[PDB]
Design a protein around this ligand. Structure first.
Ligand SMILES: CN(C)c1ccc(C(=O)N(CC(=O)NCc2ccccc2)Cc2ccc(C(=O)NO)cc2)cc1
Ligand SMILES: [K+]
Ligand SMILES: [K+]
Ligand SMILES: [Zn+2]
Length: 357
């Protein structure tokens, strides 16, 4: 029962060459990694080597046009990199972005393979750039390829096509890319908790609302938990896990759990506006570990307070290693709008899940 860890400093090379103060800094992952060494979590883990995703593996979720357009950025001069990135919503590109995107996806492939072959029980992936905003045919919100979506498809390719994968997305933003990719799919259950503000928060789309339950055979397999008008924290996310995430997950019975683990909902994040504590993330991780015989892969998405994301993700790795979960409140009453949100999701998904009756 070992925990895997994958990290490669080459993923720092991707950067915003016109703004050295951009929040998607290279030091996001180096600070997370350095904290794992200071807390002596690194030497307790088994080091998974990073690798490059192949274009065939990328084609599991993305179109040939999108892959070839991102690949062509390798050769561009800065003036043309700037024009190309301006065609997207919140995207900056450099000459090494494609390679870094390949390394983030290939690293999680090796981690899922290590989990599904039994080499490790679970794993953590300290990777960048993130992926959950990336669509089949376009890049968006600092994401080029959908690392979590690709990993679920890669997981099915090395086991069986119908492998039931649960994607839990606790990044403060809606994973619009992951939802659309698996929207008609009933083998991948997508559960996202995200700040919504009636569609005013990025990515500013009503697709993130609670009534989007999936399409076709995927009806019931898309669970949006949208927060509105409130500084959500540990009590709200714990109650969402107790009423929605866990009863639906246990009925779905996943064989593999992927966590789009953004930490921009953590306390102190400069743009998330929430106050989830590192002990809160630790509790959420310990919960998910009770699923799928403990086969949990935690993939870094967003998070932009260097101290916050380093302490938060370190708490998650400590849970995967088997350390005792923190004791939290449980009796703290929720903000009223959070009870409204949880009740709205229960109402929209009760027809599809007998555990929600
Ligand atoms: C350079 N600096 C300091 C910022 C730049 C953009 C924002 C921002 O606001 N966005 C969201 C957004 O709404 N942009 C439109 C807009 C228009 C006018 C005013 C304000 C915003 C970008 C963003 C995208 C994805 C993720 C993510 O993947 N997180 O995990 C994070 C952030 C903040 C600071
Ligand atoms: K989310
Ligand atoms: K789905
Ligand atoms: Zn985010």
């Amino acid at each position: 029962p070992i925990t895997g860890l994958v990290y490669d400093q080459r993923m720092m090379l991707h950067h915003n060459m016109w703004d050295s103060h951009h929040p998607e800094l290279p030091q996001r992952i180096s600070r997370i990694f350095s904290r794992h060494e200071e807390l002596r979590l690194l030497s307790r883990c088994h080091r998974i080597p990073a690798r490059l995703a192949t274009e065939e593996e990328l084609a599991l979720c993305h179109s040939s046009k999108h892959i070839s357009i991102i690949k062509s950025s390798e050769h561009m001069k800065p003036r043309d990199l700037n024009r190309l990135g301006d065609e997207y919503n919140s995207i900056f590109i450099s000459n090494e972005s494609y390679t870094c995107a390949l390394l983030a996806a290939g690293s999680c492939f090796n981690s899922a393979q290590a989990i599904l072959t039994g080499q490790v029980r679970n794993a953590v992936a300290i990777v960048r750039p993130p992926g959950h905003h990336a669509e089949k045919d376009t890049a968006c919100g600092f994401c080029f390829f959908n690392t979590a979506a690709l990993t679920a498809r890669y997981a099915q390719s090395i086991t069986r096509e119908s492998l039931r994968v649960l994607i839990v997305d606790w990044d403060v933003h809606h994973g619009n890319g992951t939802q659309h990719i698996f929207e008609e799919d009933d083998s991948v259950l997508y559960i996202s908790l995200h700040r919504y503000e009636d569609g005013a928060f990025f990515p500013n789309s009503e697709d993130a609302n609670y009534d989007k339950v999936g399409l076709g055979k995927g009806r019931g397999y898309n669970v949006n938990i949208p927060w509105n008008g409130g500084k959500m924290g540990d009590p709200e996310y714990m109650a969402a896990f107790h009423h929605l995430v866990m009863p639906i997950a246990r009925e779905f019975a996943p064989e593999l759990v992927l966590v789009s683990a953004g930490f921009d909902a953590a306390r102190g994040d400069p743009l998330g506006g929430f106050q989830v504590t590192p002990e809160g993330y630790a509790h959420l991780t310990h919960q998910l570990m009770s699923l799928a015989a403990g086969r949990v892969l935690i993939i870094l998405e967003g998070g932009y307070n260097l101290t916050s994301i380093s302490e938060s993700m370190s708490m998650c790795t400590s849970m995967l290693l088997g350390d005792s979960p923190p004791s939290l409140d449980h009796l703290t009453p929720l903000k009223t709008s959070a009870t409204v949100s949880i009740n709205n999701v229960l109402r929209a998904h009760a027809p599809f899940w007998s555990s929600l009756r």
